[PDB]
Amino acid sequence: GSSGSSGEEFVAIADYAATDETQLSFLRGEKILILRQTTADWWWGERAGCCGYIPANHVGKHSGPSSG
């Protein structure tokens, strides 16, 4: 199947739309995988069978109790 190998699960604080063909587009809440950070501004995420870069602001927060 498709198993993850070390990653950071995050949630989009707001729906975003990749402006380039090197960005990932998700919807607020979407579980974004922060493969690598690299920069404190640009993060390296990974979509479904996709691999692109993601910004550092649209994603944040953490998972736990009371998620809605």
Q: How far apart are CA 15 and CA 4, in angstroms?
A: 23
18-37 b/e (C-beta count within 10 Å ≥ 16 → b): eeeeebbebeeeeebbbbee
- Give the method used: NMR
Q: For residue 38, which of 52, 27, 25 has the smallest C-alpha distance?
A: 52
Question: How many C-beta atoms surround the C-beta of residue 46 within 10 A?
Answer: 17
Q: For residue 43, which of 26, 64, 58, 61 has the smallest C-alpha distance?
A: 58
32 φ, ψ (degrees, to nearest 5): -90, 135
DSSP helix/strand/coil, 67: coil
Annotated domain spans of the chain = 1-68
